[PDB]
């Protein structure tokens, strides 16, 4: 999969997946406000040794 480029703004977080995988250049960034729920889920999906690497 591809990752966005997160822009910090206000009290929330927006994404922008340029992703460069159209038939062309894919100049469509998904300006999508990332849900706290999905951040919570994906944070639940991290490894323990990843915590230790990140300093948790």
């Amino acid at each position: 999969n591809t990752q966005p480029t997160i822009r910090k703004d206000g009290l929330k977080l927006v994404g922008s997946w340029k992703k460069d995988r159209a038939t062309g250049d894919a100049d469509e960034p998904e300006l999508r406000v990332l849900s706290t729920e999905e951040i919570l889920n994906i944070f639940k999906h991290i490894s323990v040794k990843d915590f230790t690497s990140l300093g948790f």
């Binding site: 206000g10 009290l11 929330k12 706290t36």
Partner: protein
């Protein structure tokens, strides 16, 4: 829980997150101020614990 037309949800949760953010801190980047009655802004915990006789 009742009829959610999906255009009050966003600002309702934004207000909820805003207010819990305010209660946590009111010394944030100056887009809100979030004062109560009267014109004295509500002091949050960071204001309660900051330097010069705030609890430490």
């Amino acid at each position: 829980h009742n009829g959610a037309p999906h255009h009050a949800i966003e600002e309702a949760e934004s207000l909820l997150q805003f207010h819990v953010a305010t209660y946590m801190d009111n010394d944030i980047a100056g887009q809100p101020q979030a004062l109560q009655k009267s014109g004295r802004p509500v002091k949050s915990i960071r204001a309660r614990l900051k330097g010069k006789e705030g609890r430490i």
